[PDB]
Design a protein around this ligand. Structure first.
Ligand SMILES: [Ca+2]
Ligand SMILES: [Cl-]
Length: 224
């Protein structure tokens, strides 16, 4: 996250870190045993780290759980990042407490101008790299489809939307992908991609969670 602030420790209890030796992506806990993330974050083996604040120091509330089953969206395209969404089933259900909790599915797509909360352990710079110790947070509004499409002509599919600031300076960035965009207490977006981080007229592009409500519910029911 570029231009954000350090979240208050454990104040985003649904935020998880995806690990394979080091942090590489985010995800969102939507049920005791299930995480939502991005299809392009997929690895053969992933460890889910919950209850994290400083991801480089054990502090006392962490839960580490290895993923049992990973399901990319069947229509995911590695080149265009269409349908960039994925489900991870934990090998054991997470213990639910003040520090590790779930975030809800949306009931409608978020309207342009809705204030949202993006978060992750991604790069904090527009140039070069600084990966933070502690979880970063950004308040950012949903942008219109027209603004989105104008910022990335020809690249915005029906699965994607933009959130951020066209003036630049505040954005998601590398290794934030797969993490949450939460608006009015529902998971509306999955961090996916952009050109640069926090460049003028180059807002982050996120996967529309609402488009996959049926697929999420049915896949999870069918694999429980
Ligand atoms: Ca930690
Ligand atoms: Cl692309």
């Amino acid at each position: 996250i570029v231009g954000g602030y350090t979240c208050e420790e454990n104040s985003l209890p649904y935020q998880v870190s995806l690990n394979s030796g080091s942090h590489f992506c985010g995800g969102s806990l939507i049920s005791e045993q299930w995480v939502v993330s991005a299809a392009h974050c997929y690895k053969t083996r992933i460890q889910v780290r919950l209850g994290e604040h400083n991801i480089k120091v054990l502090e006392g509330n962490e839960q580490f759980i290895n993923a049992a089953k990973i399901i990319r969206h069947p229509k995911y395209n590695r080149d265009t990042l269409d349908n960039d969404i994925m489900l991870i089933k934990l090998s054991s259900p997470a213990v639910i407490n003040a520090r590790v909790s779930t975030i809800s599915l949306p009931t409608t797509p978020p309207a342009a101008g809705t204030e949202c909360l993006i978060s992750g352990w991604g790069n904090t710079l527009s140039f070069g790299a600084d990966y933070p110790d502690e979880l970063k947070c950004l308040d950012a509004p949903v942008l219109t489809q027209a603004e989105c499409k104008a910022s990335y002509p020809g690249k915005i599919t029906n699965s994607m939307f933009c959130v951020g600031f066209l003036e630049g300076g505040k954005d998601s960035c590398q290794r934030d992908a797969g993490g949450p965009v939460v608006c009015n207490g529902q998971l509306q977006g999955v961090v996916s991609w952009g050109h640069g981080c926090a460049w003028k007229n180059r807002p982050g592009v996120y996967t529309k969670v609402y488009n996959y409500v049926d697929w999420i519910k049915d896949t999870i029911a069918a694999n429980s």
